[PDB]
């Protein structure tokens, strides 16, 4: 019964080798890299601001205001997972589905 | 007597400083942590200048407190003060401390302190006798903390012979001591001993001998950054002579990075001078920034003119630098590597020819490279398209060279290859930085619910169940 | 001269040797130079004339080309030209190194997840 | 008629900085006129600390009589200002206190006491409660920064000025800061930003303490030709109503601008040579006079080749009024640098243009600038560990 | 005058260096584990802690004797409450925001002070701030 | 710190008068030794007889 | 005692390998439990939830919230809450019983 | 099984009592109360009758553990 | 004027029109991200040297 339930959310073998649409993959890469462009600009400000910040404001002043460092990591994590999988799956498909 | 008052005021504080370091050495043995020795040797360059003849005498006769053969050895080699008014008896050892012999950890330090000043007074013959007497002391002993002291002693032991211009009798001592350090896994001594041997070999142009040693011996990974800097320079110099330019450039760049950030100007100059040649010997272009630094501007000027000559890729300007700064390069130990730059001047000159001309006459190529005859340019271009320097073809009957149409660089694997070495290096920095994150040994699970405060809820919750339900 | 390709001066080095003792090692070098010069020609010249390569290879008699030609396997043309069509063996960008690239991209994922 | 009266105070007088630079040149060291006008500024304003540095760096003979009469008045005036500050701090109010230490700062800045002026201005800023008065001190520090090319002073105060203009929406001061920023951008070879800032303030220029309006438009045209595309140049500079009006009284600069736009390459090279000598003698454009002329030559060669598939060497030599050998050497240098998208067929003397994609140029910059960034990251980790 | 004393000590010192390396490494690994373990432990206890009833927000009228304070709970009028042993009665100033326990209404935390009534009065009036530089004539 | 007194520190003899003191994207092309463009153009205007 | 020291060191080294193997194993399973602890904490967010207003953040984990019932409370904040969303005048769901910011 | 796994450590280490308060010390503070109980019992089994100060110093905070 | 992309062949008297690709804004954003990330490294440098 445990192995049977492990089939929940188990994707089909087609999806593993399925390549994401390259037009949208570049567009997603386009958008997120642009998002980090503003975040990097804000990240510089956060470094100088936190240099002159009392230790009581390390968390209170971060409440309600977006953290450039936190979103930068999420954008980096998403892009590197997205591109590595797209590259690896593409490289696998070039030999697996080979006409020769 | 204003000078005497100030000097004596400066003398006593130095004596306290020497007293401070020894207690770190003694507490290193007491605590059984050899790393405590480093803070005494951390200030060793500072104290080396802050000591005079009077400073030495008070320490040597005031710290031993036992008139063994040691006090009969180093006292006669230093001048003694007269019957000063402030006869402050500097005796850190009292009672049983005075009777007990000094530790081999500490007695090596003062003896090294003596041998440093004998170098500053240019008493190399007298310094040699003291250093030779010193090296009997550490050779016999087998302590673990003394090895950290021993590494500094070996450095100055090669230094006293450096000013004696022998440098050969130390090779047997350095090699023998290296095995003693290697078999004991003395990382600090082994790193210094290997560096001193390479300097020994390179001083006599024993580049073959030094290459063999670095091929078999393994430099300590857990070595001082100052010893890593010397090793990377010495290895890089070896590789440059052995036509291993690519590995040479990486090492000297690493040696520059590990060099001290505010001192060791002379070492930066020497490494910069060799790295400029290697980068030119590798076909790359030296960074323009390094010639702008105040410390390197005057020293790198002959190499700045040489870099300019190589960059334009004309034999005429390259030879002018050689005929103008040949003596400077010879005294700099870089003349022989400069001579090979003539091939790079031709190579980069041909590279600009193909990069700019779709079809150029061989007589013209001889003019742009200032070669002898177009027949000579015919052979020179012939290898360049064989070695892959330029992509072109020669029409012997017509007499020109036809450069190949440039291929789309972004449509091949080269951008991936360039990114791969950049991506893997960034991923290496992150792993290196994460592994360097240290957590202090704070009392964990103490920020949880306190025993007394958690007990408050249970009693209050009991009344909540005993009253609301009823 | 050998490194920069001044093969003209390498053969001219015979005449201006410093002493009579140096002769032996010069000929040993000159045998290596002969293959090195022709090694350029295959990748340099797309076709070079018969007696045109006589001075390039520093061959005295035309017969000394014939034995060297078959040793190097040079297909002589009817117009006294050697056809060196061999650049077709390009670096072979026709093939994507999928296994090598897949090996590298996997290593990136390892350096991101294996760290823990 | 009141244009110069609208500008901020001329402290430090940036003309002295140009005069000091001119004497540093080997060509103009012995110029009596430049020496006389500099000495007139020193004598009039009693710049005793500046006279010491002027005589030390240029190896001059210090007039003891002139120096002593200038030092005495500096002591007398500094004593007067110290007395005024003492009187203000005991009887008058805080505003009169601030005006007392302000005048001390300007006098120190006027006489060339740079270190004293910075300290005095810092103390004045601490107890200056008016926002615009605070921003005048910052503009004073920016002028001091430009006078000595103190990049740390300029960058810090430019950032401070930006903050102050945000709190109080002073568009007038904002326009002045662009001229200040543009002058620094010229000094640091940022012609792309200098052109943008200058063109914004070409119709709002009131910073006469830095330069004349004719000189400002001259700089605006110069930075525009090297940093603006052809469509951007025609809308802003060629058809600029404010620039065209000034160019009526500046026939040389107008000829330089329109020669390239109207594809008159022979005249443009003649004008570029004239422009080159102006920028060599100009303290702001001197470090970049070689770079600017080279880039402008690259622009002219690229503009001529842009519309044609192949141009013969003789035609290009004829177009620029130069020899074939000159055009061959210039092209081969620029093509090797990767700045010209063409190749020369020297046997037939034909230059054939290429069209490389923007992806390649972007990739090299990413490799270049990324490697520069990576070197900082590697170096910073080295500082962290030890 | 020794046997394998040199051989034994060579073996012993070889182990001591290896032992010291692993003890240094183990303490690094143990600290990594302890931080994760406390983070897990704090999370499980947080679920129980979040179920504890929240504290009222009150305004201090005036402190009284015997560690008593007169507070105004926001909707529920005035109370006379005790003060937690970790709160100093001298720090309980009038017109201060304090947190009172759910059942006992005990003053246990001095919340950040509210807006000064004078400040609030000047926000609604909103007189434009002026300096001498923006006055002409 | 173990400073490198072993290596011969060649005397500075440098110009402490702010020789360059600049921060640009400096490249090697500005240091090429050549006459000013005015001299180059003036040396070629008369080469054509003008 | 020279052999005993050598053997005692050998056991102490071997024990260190055992300890360092179990710490790495525990870290693997502690990461599993952290995700489980994060997941089981979300039951504090089960409906129904009274809606409050975020007024002020006293510290990292506590805040002052104004419940729609009309009372201001000093409560705790769930650690799994994106504090970037705790803007002034932000609608927040409070635990129906404990008024905690969930 | 986890509680018995820690408990079984005491039977292996009683001959060398000083070693249990080091292997079990970290398990004494674990998130799992059963492992914490096992660490307590492991100290009791291994250090039985020894009066080990280190083992007792571990158990003293345990006597106020949240879990009964 | 960049009104259309092409080149003129004077010798043959023909106009060669080109279908240029739009610039890759991903590289444009990547380049300025590197520039803005460099300023962060500058800021982390001041924090690194001043606090240690």
Swiss-Prot record, chain D:
Transmembrane stretches, start-end: none
Organism this protein belongs to: Homo sapiens (Human)
SMART domains registered for this protein in UniProt: PINT (SM00088)
Complex and partners: Component of the 19S proteasome regulatory particle complex. The 26S proteasome consists of a 20S core particle (CP) and two 19S regulatory subunits (RP). The regulatory particle is made of a lid composed of 9 subunits including PSMD6, a base containing 6 ATPases and few additional components.
Domain PCI: 190-358
Name of the protein in question: 26S proteasome non-ATPase regulatory subunit 6
SUPFAM superfamilies: TPR-like, Winged helix' DNA-binding domain
GO-annotated biological processes: proteasome-mediated ubiquitin-dependent protein catabolic process
Swiss-Prot record, chain E:
Coiled-coil intervals, chain numbering: none
Family membership: Belongs to the AAA ATPase family.
Role, per record: Component of the 26S proteasome, a multiprotein complex involved in the ATP-dependent degradation of ubiquitinated proteins. This complex plays a key role in the maintenance of protein homeostasis by removing misfolded or damaged proteins, which could impair cellular functions, and by removing proteins whose functions are no longer required. Therefore, the proteasome participates in numerous cellular processes, including cell cycle progression, apoptosis, or DNA damage repair.
Protein name stated in the entry: 26S proteasome regulatory subunit 8
Keywords: Acetylation, ATP-binding, Cytoplasm, Nucleotide-binding, Nucleus, Phosphoprotein, Proteasome
Subcellular location: Cytoplasm; Nucleus
Gene Ontology CC: blood microparticle; cytoplasm; cytoplasmic vesicle; cytosol; cytosolic proteasome complex; extracellular exosome; inclusion body; membrane
GO terms classed as biological process: negative regulation of DNA-templated transcription; negative regulation of programmed cell death; positive regulation of DNA-templated transcription; positive regulation of inclusion body assembly; positive regulation of proteasomal protein catabolic process; proteasome-mediated ubiquitin-dependent protein catabolic process; regulation of transcription by RNA polymerase II
GO molecular function term, any single one: transcription factor binding
Gene: PSMC5
Phosphoserine PTM positions: 104
Disulphide bond pairs: none
UniProtKB/Swiss-Prot annotation, chain F:
GO cellular component terms, semicolon-separated: cytosol; integrator complex; nucleoplasm; proteasome complex; proteasome regulatory particle, lid subcomplex; protein-containing complex
Tissue specificity statement from the Swiss-Prot or TrEMBL entry: Expressed in limb bud, craniofacial primordia and skin.
Subcellular location: Nucleus
GO biological process, one term: proteasome-mediated ubiquitin-dependent protein catabolic process
Source taxon at top rank: Eukaryota
Major localization class: nucleus
Keyword terms of this UniProt record: Nucleus, Proteasome
UniProt keyword Lipoprotein, yes or no: no
Coiled-coil blocks: none
Family label: Belongs to the DSS1/SEM1 family.
Binding partners and assembly: Component of the 19S proteasome regulatory particle complex. The 26S proteasome consists of a 20S core particle (CP) and two 19S regulatory subunits (RP). The regulatory particle is made of a lid composed of 9 subunits including SEM1, a base containing 6 ATPases and few additional components. Belongs to the TREX-2 complex (transcription and export complex 2), composed of at least ENY2, GANP, PCID2, SEM1, and either centrin CETN2 or CETN3. Component of the homologous recombination repair (HR) complex composed of ERCC5/XPG, BRCA2, PALB2, DSS1 and RAD51. Interacts with the C-terminal of BRCA2.
Name this polypeptide is given: 26S proteasome complex subunit SEM1
Taxonomic placement: Eukaryota, Metazoa, Chordata, Craniata, Vertebrata
Gene: SEM1
Coverage span on the entire protein: 16 to 65 of 70
Curated annotation (Swiss-Prot), chain I:
Inducing stimuli: By FOXO4; expression in embryonic stem cells (ESCs) is mediated by FOXO4.
Changes after translation: Phosphorylated by AMPK.
Tissues expressing this chain: Highly expressed in embryonic stem cells (ESCs). Expression decreases as ESCs differentiate.
Subcellular location field: Nucleus; Cytoplasm, Cytosol
Subunit structure: Component of the 19S proteasome regulatory particle complex. The 26S proteasome consists of a 20S core particle (CP) and two 19S regulatory subunits (RP). The regulatory particle is made of a lid composed of 9 subunits including PSMD11, a base containing 6 ATPases and few additional components.
Function field: Component of the 26S proteasome, a multiprotein complex involved in the ATP-dependent degradation of ubiquitinated proteins. This complex plays a key role in the maintenance of protein homeostasis by removing misfolded or damaged proteins, which could impair cellular functions, and by removing proteins whose functions are no longer required. Therefore, the proteasome participates in numerous cellular processes, including cell cycle progression, apoptosis, or DNA damage repair. In the complex, PSMD11 is required for proteasome assembly.
Family: Belongs to the proteasome subunit S9 family.
Protein name: 26S proteasome non-ATPase regulatory subunit 11
Native species: Homo sapiens (Human)
């Amino acid at each position: 019964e445990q192995k049977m339930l492990l089939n929940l959310h188990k994707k089909s073998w087609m999806e593993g080798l399925t390549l994401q649409d390259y037009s949208e993959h570049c567009k997603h890469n386009e958008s997120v890299v642009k998002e980090m462009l503003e975040l990097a600009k804000n990240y510089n400000k956060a470094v100088e601001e936190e240099d002159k910040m009392t230790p009581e404001q390390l968390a209170i002043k971060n409440v309600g205001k977006q953290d450039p460092k936190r979103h930068l990591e999420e954008h980096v994590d998403v892009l590197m997972t997205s591109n590595i999988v797209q590259c690896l799956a593409a490289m696998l498909d070039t030999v697996v589905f080979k006409l020769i | 007597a204003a000078a005497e008052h100030s000097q004596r005021e400066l003398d006593t504080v130095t004596l306290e400083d020497i007293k401070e370091h020894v207690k770190q050495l003694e507490k290193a043995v007491s605590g059984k942590e050899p790393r405590f020795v480093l803070r005494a040797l951390r200030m060793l360059p500072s104290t080396s200048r802050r000591l005079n003849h009077y400073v030495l005498y008070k320490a040597v006769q005031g710290f031993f407190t036992s008139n063994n053969a040691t006090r009969d050895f180093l006292l006669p080699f230093l001048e003694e003060p007269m019957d000063t008014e402030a006869d402050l008896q500097f005796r850190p050892r009292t009672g049983k401390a005075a009777s007990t012999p000094l530790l081999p950890e500490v007695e090596a330090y003062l003896q090294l302190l003596v041998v440093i000043f004998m170098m500053n007074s240019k008493r190399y013959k007298e310094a040699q006798k003291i250093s030779d007497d010193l090296m009997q002391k550490i050779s016999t002993q087998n302590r673990r903390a003394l090895d950290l002291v021993a590494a500094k002693c070996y450095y100055y032991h090669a230094r006293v012979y450096e000013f004696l211009d022998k440098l050969d009798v130390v090779r047997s001592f350095l090699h023998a001591r290296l095995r003693t350090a290697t078999l004991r896994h003395d990382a600090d001594g082994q790193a210094t001993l290997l560096n001193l041997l390479l300097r020994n070999y390179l001083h006599y142009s024993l580049y073959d001998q030094a290459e063999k040693l670095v091929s078999k011996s393994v430099f300590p990974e857990q070595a001082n950054n100052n010893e890593w800097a010397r090793y990377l320079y010495y290895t890089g110099r070896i590789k440059a002579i052995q036509l291993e330019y690519s590995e040479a450039r990486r090492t000297m760049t690493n040696a520059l990075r590990k060099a001290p950030q505010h001192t060791a100007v002379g070492f930066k100059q020497t490494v910069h001078k060799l790295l400029i040649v290697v980068e030119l010997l590798l076909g790359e272009i030296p960074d323009r920034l390094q010639f702008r630094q105040p410390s390197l501007k005057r020293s790198l000027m002959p190499y700045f003119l040489l870099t300019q000559a190589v960059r334009t890729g004309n034999l005429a300007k390259f030879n002018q630098v050689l005929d103008q700064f040949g003596e400077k390069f010879q005294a700099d130990g870089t003349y022989t590597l400069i001579i090979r730059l003539r091939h790079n001047v031709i190579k980069t000159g041909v590279r600009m020819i193909s990069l700019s001309y779709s079809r150029i006459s061989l007589a013209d190529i001889a003019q742009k490279l200032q070669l002898d005859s177009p027949e000579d340019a015919e052979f020179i271009v012939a290898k360049a398209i064989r070695d892959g320097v330029i992509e072109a073809s020669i029409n012997h009957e017509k007499g020109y060279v036809q450069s190949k149409e440039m291929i789309d660089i972004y449509s091949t694997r080269e951008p991936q290859l360039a990114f791969h070495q950049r991506i893997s290096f960034c991923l290496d920095i992150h792993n290196m930085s994460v592994k360097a994150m240290r957590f202090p040994p704070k009392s964990y699970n103490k920020d949880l619910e306190s025993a007394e405060e958690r007990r408050e809820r249970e009693q209050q919750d009991l009344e909540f169940a005993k009253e609301m339900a009823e | 001269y050998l490194m920069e390709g001044s093969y003209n001066k390498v053969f001219l080095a015979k005449g201006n040797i410093p002493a009579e003792s140096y002769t032996f090692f010069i000929d040993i070098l000159l045998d290596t130079i002969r293959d090195e010069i022709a090694g350029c020609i295959e990748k340099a010249y797309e076709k070079i004339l018969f007696t045109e390569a006589t001075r390039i290879l520093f061959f005295n008699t035309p017969k000394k080309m014939t034995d060297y030609a078959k040793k190097r396997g040079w297909v002589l043309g009817p117009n006294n030209y050697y056809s060196f069509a061999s650049q077709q063996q390009k670096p072979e960008d026709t093939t994507i190194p999928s296994t090598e690239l897949a090996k590298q991209v996997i290593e990136y994922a390892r350096q991101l997840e294996m760290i823990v | 008629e009141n244009l110069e009266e609208e500008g901020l105070p001329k402290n430090p007088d940036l003309r002295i900085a140009q005069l000091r630079f001119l004497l540093s040149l080997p060509e103009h060291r012995g110029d009596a006129a430049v020496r006389d006008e500099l000495m007139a500024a020193v004598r009039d304003n009693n710049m005793a600390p500046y006279y010491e540095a002027l005589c030390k760096s240029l190896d001059w003979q210090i007039d003891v009589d002139l120096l002593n009469k200038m030092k005495k008045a500096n002591e007398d005036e500094l004593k007067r200002l110290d007395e005024e500050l003492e009187d203000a701090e005991k009887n008058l109010g805080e505003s009169e206190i601030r005006d007392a230490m302000m005048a001390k700062a300007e006098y120190l800045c006027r006489i060339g006491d740079k270190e004293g002026a910075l300290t005095a201005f810092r103390k004045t800023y601490d107890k200056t409660v008016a926002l615009g008065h605070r921003l005048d001190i910052v503009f004073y520090l920016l002028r001091i920064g430009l006078f000595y090319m103190d990049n740390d002073l300029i960058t810090r105060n430019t950032e401070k000025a930006k903050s102050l203009i945000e709190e109080g929406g002073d568009w007038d001061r904002r326009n002045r800061l662009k001229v200040y920023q543009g002058l620094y951008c010229v000094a640091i070879r940022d012609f792309k930003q200098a052109a943008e800032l200058f063109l914004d303030t070409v119709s709002t220029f009131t910073s006469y303490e830095l330069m004349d309006y004719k000189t400002f438009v001259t700089y605006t045209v110069y930075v525009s030709m090297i940093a603006l595309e052809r469509p951007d140049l025609r809308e802003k500079v060629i058809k600029g109503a404010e620039i065209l009006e000034v160019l009526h009284s500046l026939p040389a600069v107008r000829q330089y601008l329109f020669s390239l736009y109207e594809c008159r390459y022979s005249v443009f090279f003649q004008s570029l040579a004239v422009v080159e000598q102006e920028m060599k003698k100009d303290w702001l454009f001197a470090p970049h006079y070689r770079y600017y002329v080279r880039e402008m030559r690259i622009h002219a060669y690229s503009q001529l080749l842009e519309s044609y598939r192949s141009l013969t060497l003789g035609y290009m030599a004829e177009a620029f009024g130069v020899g074939v050998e000159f055009i061959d050497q210039e092209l081969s240098r620029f093509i090797a640098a990767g700045r010209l998208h063409c190749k020369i067929d020297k046997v037939n003397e034909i230059v054939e243009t290429n069209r490389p994609d923007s992806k390649n140029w972007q990739y090299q910059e990413t490799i270049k600038k990324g490697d520069l960034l990576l070197n900082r990251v590697q170096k910073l980790s080295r500082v962290i560990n030890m | 005058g020794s046997g394998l004393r040199q051989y034994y000590l060579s073996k012993i010192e070889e182990l001591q260096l290896i032992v010291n390396d692993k003890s240094q490494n183990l303490r690094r690994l143990q600290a990594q584990r302890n931080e994760l373990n406390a983070k897990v432990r704090l999370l499980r206890e947080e679920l129980q802690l979040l179920q504890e009833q929240g504290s009222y927000v009150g305004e201090v009228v005036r402190a009284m004797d015997k560690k008593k304070v007169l507070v105004k709970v926001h909707p529920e009028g005035k109370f006379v409450v005790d003060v937690d042993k970790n709160i100093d009665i001298n720090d309980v100033t009038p017109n201060c925001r304090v947190a009172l326990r759910n059942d006992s209404y005990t003053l246990h935390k001095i919340l950040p002070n509210k807006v000064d009534p004078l400040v609030s009065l000047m926000m609604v009036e909103k007189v434009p701030d002026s300096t001498y530089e923006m006055i002409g004539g | 710190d173990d400073e490198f007194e072993e290596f011969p520190a060649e005397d500075w003899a440098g110009l402490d008068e702010d020789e360059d003191a600049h921060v640009w994207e400096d490249n090697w092309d500005d240091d090429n030794v050549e006459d000013d463009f005015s001299n180059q153009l003036r040396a070629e205007l008369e080469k054509h007889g003008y | 005692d020279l052999y005993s020291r050598y053997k005692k060191l050998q056991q102490e080294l071997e024990f260190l390998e055992v300890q360092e193997e179990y710490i790495k194993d525990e870290q693997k399973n502690l990461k599993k439990e952290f995700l489980h602890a994060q997941e089981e904490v979300k039951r504090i967010q089960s409906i129904p939830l009274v809606i409050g207003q975020f007024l002020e953040a006293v510290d990292q984990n506590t805040a002052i919230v104004g419940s729609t019932t009309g009372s201001n409370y000093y409560v705790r904040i769930l650690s799994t809450i994106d504090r970037e969303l705790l803007k002034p005048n932000a609608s927040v769901a409070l635990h129906k019983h404990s008024n905690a910011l969930v | 099984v986890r509680r018995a796994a820690v408990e079984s450590l005491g039977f292996i280490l009683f001959r060398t009592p000083e070693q249990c308060p080091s292997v079990v010390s970290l398990l004494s503070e674990s998130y799992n109360p059963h492992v914490r109980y096992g660490a307590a019992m492991a100290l009791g089994i291994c250090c039985a009758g020894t009066g080990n100060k280190e083992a007792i110093n571990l158990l003293e905070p345990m006597t106020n553990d949240p879990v009964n | 004027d960049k009104k259309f992309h092409g080149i003129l062949d004077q010798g043959e008297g023909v106009l060669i029109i080109f279908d240029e690709p739009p610039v890759d804004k991903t590289y444009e954003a990547a380049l300025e991200t590197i520039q803005n990330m460099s300023k962060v490294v500058d800021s982390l440098y001041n924090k690194a040297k001043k606090l240690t």
